[PDB]
Design a binder for this molecule. Structure first.
Ligand code: HEM
Ligand code: T6C
Ligand code: T6C
Length: 137
């Protein structure tokens, strides 16, 4: 289920984070244009840039912290606050997050594995709603 999925992801976090972020960028090419250093790069080119590995790992670590702290796929209000607050996220609407989760759920459904895709969909929906409550437009 959802808690096991967190362990599955954590066990090979950089690999999952990279493949899921690539799925996002590839499904939603306009979102790539917000990452200047990743424009004009193939999947294998990104996987060799240090900030790409590092940044994906740090994003997914935080995502997994938020997932682990959630109750029944509902994140903590305080976690939503952090995500709205972060300087890094001053550009963003909740649409950006919705898209990430669509890509994540699709990746999970396509993978060989017994991810609880439905729970990740609900978690994403609940995170988006918590981001609105914490003030993201
Ligand atoms: C639950 C979802 C997400 C989490 C946990 C998360 C977390 C983070 C973290 C920890 C960083 C800092 C990375 C670093 O400095 O090494 C970051 C940076 C960033 N995030 Fe997110 N993020 C999420 C969703 C999104 C989405 C959907 C977008 C855009 C579509 C986005 C855009 C960015 C951008 C542009 C930065 C730039 C940091 C910089 O280099 O200045 N994030 N995010
Ligand atoms: O920074 C991101 C990562 Cl590492 C993965 C996904 Cl799915 C989306 C974003 Cl916006
Ligand atoms: O370099 C980044 C990566 Cl690969 C993922 C995200 Cl979400 C943000 C940044 Cl700044």
């Amino acid at each position: 289920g959802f808690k096991q999925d967190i362990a599955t992801i954590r066990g090979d976090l950089r690999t999952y984070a990279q493949d899921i972020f690539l799925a996002f960028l590839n499904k939603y090419p306009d979102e790539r244009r917000n990452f200047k250093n990743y424009v004009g790069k193939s999947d294998q080119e990104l996987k060799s840039m240090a900030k790409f590995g590092d940044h994906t790992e740090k994003v997914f670590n935080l995502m997994m912290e938020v997932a682990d702290r959630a109750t029944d796929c509902v994140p903590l209000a305080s976690d939503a606050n952090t995500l709205v607050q972060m300087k890094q996220h001053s550009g963003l609407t909740t649409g950006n997050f919705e898209k990430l989760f669509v890509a994540l759920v699709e990746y999970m459904r396509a993978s060989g594995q017994s991810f609880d895709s439905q729970s990740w969909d609900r978690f994403g929906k609940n995170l988006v709603s918590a981001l609105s409550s914490a003030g993201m437009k």
